[PDB]
C-alpha cells in the first residue's frame, strides 16, 4: 500500500510515534517518505546481503528474519514479511526498538541526510 502523507500521519500518531523518544510526528513522515516513498512494499537490498523492508525501510541485518542473511539477528522477533503489510502495526513497533537503542533516529539514513535539522513540520501540515 501507497499510503497518503496525511493518512500516514494518523496512522502513525495512533500507533504511538508522535514525540516518541522525542521525535514529532513530522520527524517520522519525513523519514517515510524518503525512505521508502510511502510505500509498505518497499524493498531495498544492501551490499552486506541484508535487506531493508516496509515503509521505514527495517534491516535484515539486526531487526527481524528474511532466512537469507548469515549471521544476523532477529531482535523484533518477526518475518521481515510481517513489515510489509497495508497494516504499519508491526514496522512501528520494531520502530520503536530501534529508536530506542541509543542512537535515537540517526539509525536512519535518510533521516539523518534529509530531514534531520529541516522544518519536519511541514511533513504533517495541513492533516487532520
Ligand atoms: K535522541
Same mark, same amino acid.
Given at each position: 500500500?501507497?499510503?497518503?502523507?496525511?493518512?500516514?500521519?494518523?496512522?502513525?500518531?495512533?500507533?504511538?510515534?508522535?514525540?516518541?523518544?522525542?521525535?514529532? !510526528?513530522? +520527524?517520522?513522515? &519525513?523519514? *517515510?517518505?524518503?525512505? $521508502?516513498?510511502?510505500?509498505?512494499?518497499?524493498?531495498?537490498?544492501?551490499?552486506?546481503?541484508?535487506?531493508?523492508?516496509?515503509?521505514?525501510?527495517?534491516?535484515?541485518?539486526?531487526?527481524?528474519?528474511?532466512?537469507?542473511?548469515?549471521?544476523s539477528?532477529? !531482535?523484533? +522477533?518477526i518475518? &521481515?514479511? *510481517?513489515?510489509?503489510? $497495508?497494516?504499519?502495526?508491526?514496522?512501528?513497533?520494531?520502530?520503536?526498538?530501534?529508536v530506542?537503542?541509543?542512537?535515537?533516529?540517526?539509525?536512519?539514513?535518510?533521516?539523518?541526510?534529509?530531514?534531520?535539522?529541516?522544518?519536519?513540520?511541514?511533513?504533517?501540515?495541513?492533516?487532520?
Amino acid at each position: 500500500k501507497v499510503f497518503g502523507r496525511c493518512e500516514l500521519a494518523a496512522a502513525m500518531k495512533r500507533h504511538g510515534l508522535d514525540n516518541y523518544r522525542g521525535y514529532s !510526528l513530522g +520527524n517520522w513522515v &519525513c523519514a *517515510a517518505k524518503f525512505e $521508502s516513498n510511502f510505500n509498505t512494499q518497499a524493498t531495498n537490498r544492501n551490499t552486506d546481503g541484508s535487506t531493508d523492508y516496509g515503509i521505514l525501510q527495517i534491516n535484515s541485518r539486526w531487526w527481524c528474519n528474511d532466512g537469507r542473511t548469515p549471521g544476523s539477528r532477529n !531482535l523484533c +522477533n518477526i518475518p &521481515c514479511s *510481517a513489515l510489509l503489510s $497495508s497494516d504499519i502495526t508491526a514496522s512501528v513497533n520494531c520502530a520503536k526498538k530501534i529508536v530506542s537503542d541509543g542512537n535515537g533516529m540517526n539509525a536512519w539514513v535518510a533521516w539523518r541526510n534529509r530531514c534531520k535539522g529541516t522544518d519536519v513540520q511541514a511533513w504533517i501540515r495541513g492533516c487532520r
